[PDB]
Amino acid sequence: ARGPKKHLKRLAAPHHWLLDKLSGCYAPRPSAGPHKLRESLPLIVFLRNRLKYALNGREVKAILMQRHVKVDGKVRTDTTYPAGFMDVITLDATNENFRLVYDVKGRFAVHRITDEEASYKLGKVKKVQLGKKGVPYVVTHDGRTIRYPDPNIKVNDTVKIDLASGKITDFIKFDAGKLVYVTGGRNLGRIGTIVHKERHDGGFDLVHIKDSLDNTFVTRLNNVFVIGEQGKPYISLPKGKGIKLSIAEERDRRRAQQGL
Amino acid sequence: PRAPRTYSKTYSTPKRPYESSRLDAELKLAGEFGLKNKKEIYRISFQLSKIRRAARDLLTRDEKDPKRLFEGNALIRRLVRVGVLSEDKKKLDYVLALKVEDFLERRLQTQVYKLGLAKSVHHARVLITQRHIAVGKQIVNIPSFMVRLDSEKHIDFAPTSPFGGARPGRVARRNAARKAEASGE
RNA sequence: AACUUCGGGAUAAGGAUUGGCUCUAAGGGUCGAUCAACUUAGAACUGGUACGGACAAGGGGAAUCUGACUGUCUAAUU
RNA sequence: UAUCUGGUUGAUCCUGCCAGUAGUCAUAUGCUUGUCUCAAAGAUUAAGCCAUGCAUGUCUAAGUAUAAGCAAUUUAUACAGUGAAACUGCGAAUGGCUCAUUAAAUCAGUUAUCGUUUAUUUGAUAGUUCCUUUACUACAUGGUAUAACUGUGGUAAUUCUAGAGCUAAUACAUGCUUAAAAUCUCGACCCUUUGGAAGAGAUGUAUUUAUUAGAUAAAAAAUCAAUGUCUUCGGACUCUUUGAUGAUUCAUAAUAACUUUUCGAAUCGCAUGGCCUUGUGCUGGCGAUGGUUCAUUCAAAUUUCUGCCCUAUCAACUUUCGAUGGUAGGAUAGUGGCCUACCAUGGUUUCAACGGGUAACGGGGAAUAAGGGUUCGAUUCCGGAGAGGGAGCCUGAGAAACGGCUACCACAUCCAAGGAAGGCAGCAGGCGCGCAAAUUACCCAAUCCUAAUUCAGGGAGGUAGUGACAAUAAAUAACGAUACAGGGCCCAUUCGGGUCUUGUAAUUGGAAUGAGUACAAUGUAAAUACCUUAACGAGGAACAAUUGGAGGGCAAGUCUGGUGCCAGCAGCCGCGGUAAUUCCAGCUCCAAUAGCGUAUAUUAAAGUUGUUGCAGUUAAAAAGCUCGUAGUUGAACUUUGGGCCCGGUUGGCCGGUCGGAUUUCCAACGGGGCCUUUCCUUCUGGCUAACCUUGAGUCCUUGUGGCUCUUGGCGAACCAGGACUUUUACUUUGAAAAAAUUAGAGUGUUCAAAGCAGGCGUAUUGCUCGAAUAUAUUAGCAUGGAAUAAUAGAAUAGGACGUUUGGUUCUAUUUUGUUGGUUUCUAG
RNA sequence: UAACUACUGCGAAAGCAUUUGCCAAGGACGUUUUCAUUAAUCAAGAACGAAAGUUAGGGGAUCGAAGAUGAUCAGAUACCGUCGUAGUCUUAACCAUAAACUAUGCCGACUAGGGAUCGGGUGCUUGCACUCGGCACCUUACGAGAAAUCAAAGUCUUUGGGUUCU
RNA sequence: GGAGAAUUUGGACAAACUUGGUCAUUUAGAGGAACUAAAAGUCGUAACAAGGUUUCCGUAGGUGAACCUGCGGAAGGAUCAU
Ligand SMILES: [K+]
Ligand SMILES: [K+]
Ligand SMILES: [Mg+2]
Ligand SMILES: [Mg+2]
Ligand SMILES: [Mg+2]
Ligand SMILES: [Mg+2]
Ligand SMILES: [Mg+2]
Ligand SMILES: [Mg+2]
Ligand SMILES: [Mg+2]
Ligand SMILES: [Mg+2]
Ligand SMILES: [Mg+2]
Ligand SMILES: [Mg+2]
Ligand SMILES: [Mg+2]
Ligand SMILES: [Mg+2]
Ligand SMILES: [Mg+2]
Ligand SMILES: [Mg+2]
Ligand SMILES: [Mg+2]
Ligand SMILES: [Mg+2]
Ligand SMILES: [Mg+2]
Ligand SMILES: [Mg+2]
Ligand SMILES: [Mg+2]
Incomplete structure (x- = not known):
């Protein structure tokens, strides 16, 4: 349509940002940047929606123009800066460092890390x-x-x-036995060990992935991301650790918390 | 260009409109429970229908199936919670054999009458809309309100309003004033 | 195009082109050599956009009356 | 959420329709209308026409300030603060609107670019620029030429502009800059030596062409072009460098040149430090903007496969003047008949081409829903197209742009008649059209977008107004006691004890209340309205519910008065001609109820479109008869059975505490691997992990509930290699199939429609669960199965296997120094 | 082309009947012959198709549309009666329809008794039985059907053998 | 001493206008001939009973009108019968 689109309607947003439907009409369109649009998380989402520090998109700019927040060790002043997977958001005030990493539902977690880990x-x-x-x-x-x-x-x-x-x-070389983070699909956010790779020349290579509870699953090689050796994650993993419980098993773990 | 706000019809009119056997049996329920319309009966038939449809669609599936186990127990607990379904019956099969009066018996209007408080279903509707009765803390002025079995003890007259406490009303405060000024000079 | 006796109607109606010059191609005979006609198609160039340059050479269409048609007669008014 | 009923007859059973019945985010309309939440809304006809207003502009510490602008209170004889204007930059290609066009087009899913362009973002990335390098050429910094501004003017009129004079740059146009080294060509000089060397030039990047490298299947050396090793000297004769892809002429690097020679910072702020040679010496921080290329991101363009409504009263279509293909060129960002030249004669089609129609934009979806279906989708998201109709085009990364221009056509505006200016299918509004649809309001507070950008702008968007489109909840009364008819049972005397209570009285009681009005808070950008709340506000005549009916279908009267086949009713059957169960009324009663009726369309009812699932002797309907191509359909037959063994999953059996546990065993049901005349692709190095390899045997629950590792091993435990692999259909699992919508989990929005929230603390400086899950085929992709159904194979054997045994045909690896010439042994 | 002449035959149907030749054709039966899926049903497309009717030659007895004509009758250019044109027959061309009817598509399988009969075959004790293939027919109704009725019109809500047409 | 306005050659793109041609969709029309409402009027009496000539099919001719007649069919006939 004549040239590139500058808006994004709230319904056409990525689902995994968990924007409410009513309050709005547009949604923050990620600027061009490191990560693909649908795979990113704008800072405005991270600050306002996820951490609950900002209440408006004005307050997000108030925070960004103070020059506090920095993505991979460099300050950013763009409300819709496309932060993505493995990125390190560092706030100077608070002294909280986070790494964006997917929880098992396939959404970016608030995963606080130590200042040592934020080096890489x-x-x-x-x-x-x-x-x-x-x-x-x-x-x-x-x-x-x-x-x-x-x-x-x-x-x-x-x-x-x-x-x-x-x-x-x-x-880390890509071979059988390596730990993996799945970065797209139905199994987005799951963690598990590589079992073997299927070739398919002129097509899509597939990767069979066992996990700690012995549930196999296949993904495309494009969605896989090596993160260590067997039981040796280079980063710190979030709570869960890419396990994937049933809706039953999940509902039982609520009834432990229900006691209080 | 907002998101659409969804909505749903909550009832279903009957197919043949002058069936005498039905019309009698409906007015039995409007009498017993003190309901305004046939729409109030139709509302509960429609809620039962969605439940029965849900249970039939699970009983087609095999026992020891995820979706059956998960949603079956969720349907049962949801009924057991509101006290429609009794504690003995938790099979799924029993939720199918479940009449319209088994929902009517758990609404506020009747549950006010059944706990003393009123003396009639027709009085209870008044009390509820007149903002007297209150569930635990806060006022409920909806007779449709389905009481949830862990709330039935906590039903009482409100901290606001007469009967429970507070000022003695509007009519009393005029009727106290007229007698007072008549007596005094 | 109507219409039609299916033969016609029909050059229906209606359009475009046409000179000069310099070339190209194809089409034969007789014993690979050798001999020889005009026909047709194309291209370039060229000009006061001319050019079937004089001569020669259909106007056409929609209907009606009437005799089917070609043919014949009032030499000297039909 | 699997239902029917009335209407042909004197009566019957049928066929069969008509009528009824229910729904419709499905339009209109009628009557009626208190409250809360939510909220569609000039699509349908006319993509018809539009007065007026507004809908796009933009500035930081950081391109350009001598405003003859505001300050100044004293940071400055360059400027220095805050700033109109104008230049420069960026944006105006997004958004919003609409649905006219459009039927293999769009669009959906799915591919591709080894077929291309890409502002911006983000990440990388640039000592090689003068050319006589001893003439000049400033790099302590190079050239004018212009705006705003000041004057002088024109024009009836416009976002019209002329003439003159000034002056800026991150505008415009030039132009120096700074380390070595290596390698090549050229070659002075001497010496004919297996001769070598001054010093001469060039070597960034981009551009264009040509050429070259970009290896690799394993081991041997002959024979040297020899004329190069390394001097052990018989010339030992080694070690060489090679990334990615399924795949390339790929990346990348050379070599020779080429170029109306690209870029390689003459730019800006805030800090002001360190060396001393105290000259304005040398060196130096944080970061703004800029810039070549690559990568990235935001895109774009083209693109593969399969899928579209009615029509044969459209059967042939395309190919003159591109139709299908070939070669070459041109053009394009780039592929391609995209276009041109030449050549060929192709390409589509009964498996429906081509043509016509569509009151057709596609899809996500919507309505109805036993199952299967049928109908709708202008419209909130995604994709496309358009901006009165056509075509052209400038600018720019991006437009064939219309709140850009140019022309023609249509329509229309102002004029002093000479000329000028136009485009609401943006917002509001008007006219017209019509059955058919709102205010010329308030605001950037939220949502997000743009810009030089924390500030400005935004009719995007939000807020209210209008609004019975649709949806949610839900007032219009409640309770006494005599009353007044009794009915329940007990005094049963025939008085009835008012016994247990239920109705009816224009009989009388004190309570209860928000509808409304209204302090004030709350709410909000400001309000309005909810929510909360002082004060004020029900006696039935009032705060008064309606809309349709009362023969049947169908729930409710052969009650009164009127009319007398008239008026009228009646979806249909039928009523009405003087007792009208049907008309106009009154009474009474029924149904649904803040709604109810009517019209048209549509779904179910409709097994009255029938795949599931109709009918064809006589109700409608078997072709007059046979032949016949496509189509549909098509007999049986090819490893079956048996014996084993090993893990699984449920019930077991003692679930023993009425809830969950394990041993072996009782099984049932499933799964894998062996053997039985038993493809279980084949071989070629990675690696032999392992466990009949045993250098210390008894570490150890019933010898079937078993180890501390050495030595070729036994590679189906597990990767890339050539080598060739009948081909489908079907089915399993996986993956995919945007969100919203649908089903659906959790959650007391006071309930609910909704929403995606929320919930617990020491409520005094905080902890915590969530925002699941399922479905969605037809197509494509990966995977297991091999029944069913098709398909191929050895019959004039040109058949299969082969360590044979020759011919013949090429291929090239570590060598034989190394390129190269070059016969063999090999090795395929 | 009588009688013979039938609930008999043949043919795809329309149809086909004196005798004898000639020409090809065909079903059924028999078969320890042959090929081996070559088939079933069929949009499109074709052959044949009673009578009437058409064109042109022949022929033209009889019957007979039209027409003439006598009765009947209110009328009667109707029935009845007497004549009579085309027609009725044939050759070469056309036409393409009928209550062209079993008002029943075709192919295949299965479901029930019975006797007749036509063609072929086999056994015989030589006129009877069995058999395949035909035209039909009788009883019952298992079933089917709105019923009439139907051995197919059955094996259809216990709903699917294949296929054309309406 | 290079920019550079009017103007101008040829080219492709090509609106628009005449002109024929063709397809689609609406629509006027003197008059004509049907159909329906439709059952009542006029004239007959064709059909339903052997409907007073059994009815009906195809075809052909006749004609106030239903209808009548020939040829060949059918029974849905008024005969399942020598
Ligand atoms: K003549
Ligand atoms: K009734
Ligand atoms: Mg747009
Ligand atoms: Mg003529
Ligand atoms: Mg002519
Ligand atoms: Mg004449
Ligand atoms: Mg004369
Ligand atoms: Mg080419
Ligand atoms: Mg349209
Ligand atoms: Mg649509
Ligand atoms: Mg439309
Ligand atoms: Mg317009
Ligand atoms: Mg456009
Ligand atoms: Mg335009
Ligand atoms: Mg506009
Ligand atoms: Mg626009
Ligand atoms: Mg039917
Ligand atoms: Mg046919
Ligand atoms: Mg016929
Ligand atoms: Mg008669
Ligand atoms: Mg008769």
């Missing part, structure tokens, strides 16, 4: 190819170009990133 983030490597003057580089899932990587690093490997420097500290 993981990065799924998307493409690895040779740049100008023969200099090799990798491309992470948040679109960071990193030049001069370890030649062991191939596509689909995760890569630990220093943030301050923005350099590869360490990496």
Whole structure:
């Protein structure tokens, strides 16, 4: 329609932001940025809707223009900045550091982390190819170009990133036995060990994933994200740890809390 | 360009409108429970129908099925909570065999009458709309209100209004004034 | 186009093109050589946009009366 | 949430329709209307026409201030604060509206770009610019040319502008800048040496072409183009560098040149520090804007597969002048008949092409709903198209833009008649059209969007007004005691004891109340209204419920008066001609009720469209008869049975505390692997994990409830490799199929429709559960099964397997130094 | 083309009846012959199709639309009566319809007794039985049907063998 | 000493207007000929009984009107019968 769209209607928003239907008509349209639109969480959502610090979209700007909040160690003044998976939101006041990571329902958790952990983030490597003057580089899932990587690093490997420097500290090869975070689909937010990979040339590779309670499931390779070795998560995981209980089993765990 | 606000019809009119056997049996219920309209009866027939439809659709499915186990127990507990379904019957089969009067017996209007308080269903409707009776803390002025079995003890006259306490009304405060000024000079 | 005896109506109606020059292509005969006609189609260029340049050479359509048609007669008013 | 009833007859059983009945986020209309919440609303006809107003502009510490503007109180002879104007930048391509066009088009799901462009965001990324590098060329910083502004003017008239004079830049146009090194060509000089070397030039990036690298299937050396090792010297003769993809001429890097030669910061704020050579020396922080390329994100464009309503009173269509394909070019961001030239004769179609119609924008969805269906979808989300009709186009990353321009056409405005200015299918409003639809209101407070941007702007949007579209809840009375008819049982004397209480009286009592009006709070941008609440506000004549009926279908009167086949009623059957159960009325009664009726459409009823599931002797309907192509359909037959073994899942059996537990066993039901004349793709290195490999045997519940590891192992436990693999249908599981809507869990919105909230504390500086889940095929994708149904195979054997045994045909790996020439042994 | 002539035959139906030749055709039966799914039903498209009717030659006895004509009758250009054109027959072309009817599509399977009869075959004790294939018929109704009725009009709410048409 | 206005050649794109052609959709019309309401009027009496000539089908001719007649069918006939 003549050129790019600047609005987003509240119903056409991502469901996983959990915006109320009545209060509004539009919803905050993510600016262009590191993450894809439907996979992001605008800061205005994070501040106002999720943490309950701001009450309006004016107050979100009041907070952003003080230059408190910083995403991956750099200050941002954009209400609709597209923060996404593995990003570190650091507030100076409070001294709360959070990492955006999916709970099991497939929604961004309020996952508070220690100040040590906030030094780094993981990065799924998307493409690895040779740049100008023969200099090799990798491309992470948040679109960071990193030049001069370890030649062991191939596509689909995760890569630990220093943030301050923005350099590869360490990496994890994609193989059988590695822990995984599923970052899309029905099984968004589940955690589990890789079992084997199905090939399918000129198609979509699939990844069988066991979990701690011995429930297998398959996803597309595009939705998988390596996060460690077996029982050795590089980041801190949220409460649950990507388990997926039945609606029955969930309802039983409410009746423990119901006692009070 | 807002979101649509949803809404729903809460009742269903009967198919054939001058069936004499029905019309008699309806007025039996409007008398016993003191209901304004046939619409109040139709409301409860419609709520029963959705329940029975829900239970039939589960009994088609096998025992030891997730959706049956989950929603079956949820339907049962939801009825047991409001005291429509008794504590003995919790099979699912028993929720099907469940009459219209088994809902009527748990609404405020009748539950006021049955706990003393009024002396008639026709009085209870008045008391409720006149804002006298109150559930635990707050006033309820809706006779339709289904009492939830953990609230039946807590029904009493309000902290506001006469009977319970407070000022002695509007008519008394005029009728006290007229006798007082007549006696005095 | 109507209509039709299915033969017609019909050049229906209605449009476009046409010179000069310089080329190209195709179409044959006789023993790979050799000999030879005009026909047709195309392209470039060119001009006071002319050009079937004089001559030569249908106006057409919608209906009606009437005789079917070609044919014949009042040489000198039909 | 599986239902029927009235109407053909004298009566009957049928066929069969008509009529009834219920629903409709389904329109109109009639009568009627107290309250709370919620709220559609000029789509239908006319994508008809539009007066007026408004709907897009934008500024920070940080492009440009000599406003002859406001300040100033004293940060400044450059400026310095706050700032109209104008230049510059960005935006105005979003939003909102509408549904005219449009039927393989749009659109939906699903692919693709190894087929392309992409402002912006985010992440990377730039010592190589003078060319005589000893003439000049400022880099302590380069050139005019213009606005606003000041004057002088024109014009009837407009967001019209001329002439003259000033002056800025992150505008415009130029233009220096700063480390080594390596490698190549050129080559002075001497020396014919297996000769080598001054010093000369070039080497960023982008642009255009040509060329080159971008290896790889394992082990041997011959023979050297030899003329290069490394001097052990018989010339030991090694080690070399190679990323990604299923796949490339990919990325990337060279080589030779090319270019109306791209970019490589003459820019701006706030901090002011460190070295001393105290000159305005050298060096230096935080970050604004800018910029080449790559990546990213927001997109865009094209694109694969399958899917669309009625029509044969449309059967052939397309191909002159692109139809289908080929080659080359042109054009495009790029692919492609997209276009041009040349050549071929193709392409679609009874499995419905082509044509016509649509009161057709597609989809998510809606209504009705036993199951299956039928009908609707202008309309809140997504996609498309349009801005009176057509075409063209500038600007820009993005437009074939219309609150941009240009033209033609149609319509219409102002004029001093010379000319000028137009586009509500944005908001409101008007006219017209019609059965058919609201205020020329208030506001950026919420939602979010734009900008140079915490501030400005936004008829996007929100708030109220109008509003019986639809939906939720729900007043219009309640309770006494004599009263007055009795009925319940007990005094049963025939008096009736008013016995237990139920009705009816224009009989009398004290209570209760929000509808309304209204302090004041609350609410809100400001209100209004809810919610809360002082004060005030029911006696029945008033605060007074209606709309339709009373023969049947169908619930309710052969009650009174009127009319007399008239007036009128009557969906249908029928009533009415002087006792009208039917008309006009009164009374009484019925039904639904703040609603009820009517009209039209539609769904169910309709097994009266029939797949489920109708009918065809005679009710409507078997072709006059046979042949016949498509279509539909089509006999049986190919590993079956038996013996084993191992984990599973429920009930067990002692659920023993009426609720949950495990041993072996009783089973049932399912699942896998073996063996039985038993494809269980095949081989080629990763790795042999493991457990009949045993260097210390008895670590150890009934020898079937079993180990501390060494030594080739035994690779179906587990990855990429060539090697070739009959082909479908069907079905399982997975994945997918936006949100909203539907079903559905949780949650006392006072209940409810709703909503997505909420709930517990020491309520004094806080803890906590949530915002599930299911369905949605037809198509495509992955996966298990191999019944059913189709399909292929060895019959003139051109058949199968093969360590054979020759010919023949190419392929190239570690070597044989290394390129290269080059015969073999190999190895496929 | 009588009588013979029938609840008999043949043919896809329409239809087909004196004798004998000639020409091809066909069902059924018999078969320890042959091929091996070649089939069933069929939009489109085709062949054949009573009578009447049409065009042009032949023929033209009889009957006979029209018409003439005598009765009847209120009328009677109707029935009845006497004549009579086309027609009735044939050759070459057309036409494409009928109560073209069993008012019953075709193919396949199954469900129940009976005797007659036509064609072929087999056994015989030579006129009877069995058999396949035909035209039908009688009884019952298991079933079916609104009923009349129906051995198919059955095996349909216990609803599905295949397929065309309406 | 390079920008650069009017103007102008050829080109593609191409509105719009004449003009025929074609398809679709509405609509006027003297007069004509039907149909229905429709059952009542006029004239007959064709059908229903052997409906007074059994009825009906196809066809062909006749004609105030129903109808009548020929040829060939059918029974749905007034005969299941020698
Ligand atoms: K003549
Ligand atoms: K009744
Ligand atoms: Mg738009
Ligand atoms: Mg003519
Ligand atoms: Mg002509
Ligand atoms: Mg003449
Ligand atoms: Mg003369
Ligand atoms: Mg090409
Ligand atoms: Mg339309
Ligand atoms: Mg729509
Ligand atoms: Mg429309
Ligand atoms: Mg308009
Ligand atoms: Mg547009
Ligand atoms: Mg335009
Ligand atoms: Mg406009
Ligand atoms: Mg616009
Ligand atoms: Mg029927
Ligand atoms: Mg046919
Ligand atoms: Mg016929
Ligand atoms: Mg008669
Ligand atoms: Mg008769």
